[PDB]
Amino acid sequence: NLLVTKRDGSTERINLDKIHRVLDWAAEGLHNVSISQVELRSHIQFYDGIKTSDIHETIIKAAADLISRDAPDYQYLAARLAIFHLRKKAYGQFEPPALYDHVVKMVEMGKYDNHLLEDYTEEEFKQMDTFIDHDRDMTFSYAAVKQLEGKYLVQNRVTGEIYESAQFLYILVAACLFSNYPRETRLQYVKRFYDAVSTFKISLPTPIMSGVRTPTRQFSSCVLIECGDSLDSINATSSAIVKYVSQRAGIGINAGRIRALGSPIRGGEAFHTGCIPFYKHFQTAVKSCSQGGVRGGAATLFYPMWHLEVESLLVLKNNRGVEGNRVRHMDYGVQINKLMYTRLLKGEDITLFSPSDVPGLYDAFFADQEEFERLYTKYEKDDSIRKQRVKAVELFSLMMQERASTGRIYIQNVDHCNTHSPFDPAIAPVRQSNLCLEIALPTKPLNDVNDENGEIALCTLSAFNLGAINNLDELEELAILAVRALDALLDYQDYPIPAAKRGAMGRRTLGIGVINFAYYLAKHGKRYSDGSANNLTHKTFEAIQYYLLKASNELAKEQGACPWFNETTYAKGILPIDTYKKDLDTIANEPLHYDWEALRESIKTHGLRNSTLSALMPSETSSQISNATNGIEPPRGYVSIKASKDGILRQVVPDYEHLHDAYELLWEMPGNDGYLQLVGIMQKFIDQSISANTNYDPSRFPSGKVPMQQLLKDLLTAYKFGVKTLYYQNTRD
Amino acid sequence: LLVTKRDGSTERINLDKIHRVLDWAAEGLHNVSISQVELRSHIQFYDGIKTSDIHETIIKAAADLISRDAPDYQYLAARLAIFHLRKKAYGQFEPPALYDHVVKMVEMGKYDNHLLEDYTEEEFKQMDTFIDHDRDMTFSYAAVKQLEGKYLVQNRVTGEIYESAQFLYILVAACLFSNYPRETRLQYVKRFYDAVSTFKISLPTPIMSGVRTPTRQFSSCVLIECGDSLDSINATSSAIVKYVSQRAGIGINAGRIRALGSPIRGGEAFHTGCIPFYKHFQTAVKSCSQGGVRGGAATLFYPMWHLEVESLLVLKNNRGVEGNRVRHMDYGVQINKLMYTRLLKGEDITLFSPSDVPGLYDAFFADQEEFERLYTKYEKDDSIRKQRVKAVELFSLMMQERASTGRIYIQNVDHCNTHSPFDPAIAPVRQSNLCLEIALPTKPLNDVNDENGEIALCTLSAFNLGAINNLDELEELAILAVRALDALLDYQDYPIPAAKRGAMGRRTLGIGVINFAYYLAKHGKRYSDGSANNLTHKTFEAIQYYLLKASNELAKEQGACPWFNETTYAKGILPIDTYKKDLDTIANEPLHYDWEALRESIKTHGLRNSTLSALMPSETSSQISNATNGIEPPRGYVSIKASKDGILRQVVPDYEHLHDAYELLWEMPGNDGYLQLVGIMQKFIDQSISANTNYDPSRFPSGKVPMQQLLKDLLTAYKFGVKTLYYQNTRD
Ligand SMILES: Nc1ncnc2c1ncn2[C@@H]1O[C@H](COP(=O)(O)OP(=O)(O)OP(=O)(O)O)[C@@H](O)[C@H]1O
Ligand SMILES: Nc1ncnc2c1ncn2[C@@H]1O[C@H](COP(=O)(O)OP(=O)(O)OP(=O)(O)O)[C@@H](O)[C@H]1O
Ligand SMILES: Nc1ncnc2c1ncn2[C@@H]1O[C@H](COP(=O)(O)OP(=O)(O)OP(=O)(O)O)[C@@H](O)[C@H]1O
Ligand SMILES: Nc1ncnc2c1ncn2[C@@H]1O[C@H](COP(=O)(O)OP(=O)(O)OP(=O)(O)O)[C@@H](O)[C@H]1O
Ligand SMILES: Nc1ncnc2c1ncn2[C@@H]1O[C@H](COP(=O)(O)OP(=O)(O)OP(=O)(O)O)[C@@H](O)[C@H]1O
Ligand SMILES: Nc1ncnc2c1ncn2[C@@H]1O[C@H](COP(=O)(O)OP(=O)(O)OP(=O)(O)O)[C@@H](O)[C@H]1O
Ligand SMILES: [Mg+2]
Ligand SMILES: [Mg+2]
């Protein structure tokens, strides 16, 4: 007897059968889901005159609430109901319009870029429409759909109106990235790429998902800036930061060159007032376009362990101290090499220098370990040179102490970053990383914001979904698609700063990683902690790097190698399999399955389109679209619960039904050794670095406190197996 | 029984030797006891004591005896300290020949070689004859300590003193007039040397310490206007960093930056607020500083009607969190007639983001009539984003924060442009400097090296009103001061193109006064009862007239400044035409000089400098002349300041004869008398004045200064045309 209100404002007798019919549609093919249960929970919330839209939101939430381990398929029931609603919001009906008509409408509204209509004829759009399978919208999980609705689908940010659906996003991202291709291969490339992303084999970054097809050209999310030891450079660095955080890019700042407090300037006309005031200026630059502090501008700043002010720098994040000696809203990366670790093991001292007082020492720190030790010991014995001694154990302990309590004091092993690298350290050394410590690229300081002699490193990201591929040879096709799409994006996107354009156009660096690694391991019955996954990992990441290189090599044949290819180790016939940390042989015996020697000569002859290709990023948001486990990290639980604006979102690990015992949750792990070994094995093939976490449960330790001995042990274990960087330290509460 | 000589030789102590030294210093002094000093000194002697330490002992002994009862101890101590400095620098009392000194110092790298290129040995012999080294005996003890500490060329490592005061004076003169033709050069050098060495002209610290050395960093006063864009905010930030690294004070105009929530590029993004950008300017200002003692200093300016004004006014108080506080800068609130009108009428003030109100920001400075038109237009427009606040509440909040911190300043922007040397339509004054006496045109930069931007600089100096016998001496002194500072403009370096443009275009100078309190007591006048109004009028007419006359004659000789056409002076307008008419009610002193003759001469030949006068605080330079600080009344007859070398006492000039004539700061009833005097000054002053307000809570019931009184004085200042309000001093 109740009445419902239709969208037009008409009223109708309540019809539970209509709701039932919709529930039947979403429930198709699903198991262990109850339509009546959803009906039971939903109906009780109905009142006379309720909006049909509110009815729809009710049944979405009801199904979403029922997502559990016992009935994981509710994640698809809820998702599909939400898809049904999104269709209605965008098209006024379930079935999407013809592609060309949609594009024309959206260009007219100013939501799509007009160049789509310039680069493709109406007939070509008709063809592309035949590629699309809108039913692939029914394969998203509920968390995926919410991220779509929230971050990716083109919408009105004011009114909230949704203007598109997922497959239109996918097909037009494909269409844009391959628009400049010849007609002989263009639409063939579009279809193949569309299939790859819409069936979740290739995962794309947020700025691409939300931007590519729209009038924007801001797609850079990853920026690396090196600051020189001068006022002009500090200003330039600050300016560069401001422009890029205004475009929401994450920043990696190298400030290790800045001379220490008290150092003479121009021979003594003035004296340096310390690094920290300049660090503060970088922080306000990073936070310049942020309101409040929840998820604003983000940066990681890098400095060497032997820096004269290092004891002051290590404590910049802890909640104690006064405002004057604290710079809390950035993260930090301490740069370490073999000599530092040597002093630690020997229980000797570490000498601290200002880089301005030790000629050639800073450069050698990154490019030449033999020369560094020569210079370091030479300067250690010189009394004319300003210095300070600290016990290596005390210094390392202080560092790890702050890493533990804040979780955001990172490590960069700079020797590993240059002895095992795609770059010639004598010409293009790697002297820093990025915000999340997976990017490792060459940089050059600016003397002006528009200095054409400076080099700001950028990197375009993506990931392979290890859970969606049937066999490792599928990566051949996928690498071709990924590399070619990202490489085209380099020419597509805009560059607000000349030094950044130089790096991107000069080196054409890419960073392609993985997601669903944990699921991948459980699938094959392997685990993180017992070394059972070592050989599989070796096999898996050999395939990844080989096919990436093969794709970039063939891209180089077709369109030419990157302008600065000559500065790479690849150009000199060197491959990652030549320069890896030899200790890896003791923990993995999987043989090489691909013809690297044929590749070596093919790279020698034709070069690479891209200087780097692989990097393992955290990828927390993009993973949710594929319902994948996050990057290479193990899941914290079988079902994750996250509070949000639209309520509580539950997400189940892939194939929990059959793999619950096969999974190894994070806190089920004995320690960090097994994981660190896997990371080391990955790093054997990875061009750049890996966002590696360390994890600790205080409950597993006496007195409920993690001892320093263990922290130092794990640090050294990572270094032993060639791990380049260390990201988060997670401590279970 | 034995003393250790400088060579390390030893001889028997001879108290008669010390007695002889004390007699030299005591010559001409009254109420000083040599024996008193001897008694205090002798007790500290031990076997093998250094003669150097003996000298330091008798200096401190004499310094300790400085009092109201015996002020002349300030000269006894000083002369003893001078004696010591002579020995430290020359190995003997009498200085070497000037040329020999210069040659030695150039070789050591302490003096600039261009002195030897621009002057012949024979010319140095001539300059040496100008010098009277006995003028070193005319310093007070505080003056000598500032010399030793800040001015004399010395080794910063070892502490070695390399020169004496008269060499500083003669070589500052020689450098500033080095480019003059030989027909008149040494004549200018001698006249200028006499002026500074007899304390008639006071020079800024960066000039006193720098001019003769290899440096060219002499700018201490910088005004930068920030545009509403990322490029400009970056440019401004870079410029700030560069200038604070040269220890310049900064005035930042950030009022153009749009408010939090404003759309960007039509809604592609939304503004995240002014405050994060203010924080970025602060870290730029403090970028070359360690600790919070002194270091980088800046004042930031914004209009009262800015949409975020309520958030901006409280950026300094000690409460609140780090997120809504930017505490290490000072702020200047910009106000005009309409705001005050709304206050009096008890009406509302509407708050706008300058990005939402076309032409409103420009009119705020240049056109009050047009401002009122646009303001009321936008107030009635409902499509335009806005906020209403009670005028009483807004003014009270401002004054509340001004009182508790003392560092929230006021700029009356209409007074700064209706009574100004600049055409507001072409070159408006939209900000001030760190200490709020400077009022010059600016133009925002789109890059640190933007050659189209304009950063305002100003070169400072002051007349010592206590050292002049009559106001006609200012003719000579103005000629010397104006020519010296104008020469410095071509002498100094410019780290930023935009700064050079302003300096070369307008050649703006800021010359003020010191010893004003002493000057009033000398003439038997006081601050608070209006008895000094006409004297003040007479005095500052002479200052401005002779400054203009000097600059006008320099224009005949060397040409008017390139951008002279942007001045009101170019259109035949004088300060006496545009002053706040209310001044007629509090001063009836007639004009004593031929302003109409000057008017026609300025129309014909122009001015070398767009501005000439500005009244700065002048706390350090005042001590050299033993002058009272600027226009401010002294807080006591004897100031006590603790330092590394002990407690330094300084007596007001001629306390002996004028103790009853002085009017100390807290002997004052209120602010009315002083604000009237500042207003009368402002009639003739080109730029502005660092006017302080003072309050003694003891003089008020409940021990609290009421808001009605704060507003009362605020409106009193506005009534008499006062352009800016600097510090509020609240007695402890
Ligand atoms: N008369 C009704 N009684 C109960 N539920 C209804 C009724 N009409 C629609 N619904 C339900 O409301 C939800 C939203 O439906 P829908 O978006 O189609 O709105 P609508 O009011 O039917 O407008 P339209 O005319 O555009 O179809 C669906 O779950 C649908 O089954
Ligand atoms: N064939 C279909 N398969 C899946 N979802 C569909 C289909 N047809 C419609 N939907 C979705 O189901 C919801 C309701 O659609 P529809 O308007 O046809 O039914 P109804 O509202 O219950 O009845 P009616 O509007 O005709 O009174 C909408 O969200 C729509 O997008
Ligand atoms: N006045 C200053 N106060 C504090 N730090 C300063 C100052 N000037 C420069 N610095 C810092 O000291 C270093 C000097 O570098 P800079 O290039 O700007 O000066 P320079 O004239 O080239 O002298 P140098 O020969 O010492 O490099 C930089 O780290 C800069 O940040
Ligand atoms: N024998 C002495 N007994 C007491 N005081 C002395 C004696 N000799 C010097 N003095 C005092 O020591 C102070 C410093 O004198 P001065 O600089 O001349 O040192 P000095 O040892 O005499 O060196 P020089 O040989 O260069 O003259 C003066 O006040 C001087 O009167
Ligand atoms: N004629 C003078 N007038 C003023 N001060 C003088 C004079 N001659 C020297 N002085 C200063 O007085 C102090 C003492 O001078 P001086 O060295 O001649 O005497 P002394 O040290 O007491 O005796 P001695 O010849 O044994 O060194 C020094 O600081 C010196 O610069
Ligand atoms: N991404 C951003 N986040 C926050 N504030 C920003 C951002 N971009 C610019 N701003 C601020 O917005 C204002 C305008 O920026 P700017 O002039 O540089 O950009 P624009 O492209 O010219 O846009 P507009 O046409 O709105 O001026 C300035 O105050 C600037 O600081
Ligand atoms: Mg319907
Ligand atoms: Mg330098």
Ligand SMILES: [Mg+2]
């Ligand atoms: Mg002697």
Ligand SMILES: [Mg+2]
């Ligand atoms: Mg703009």
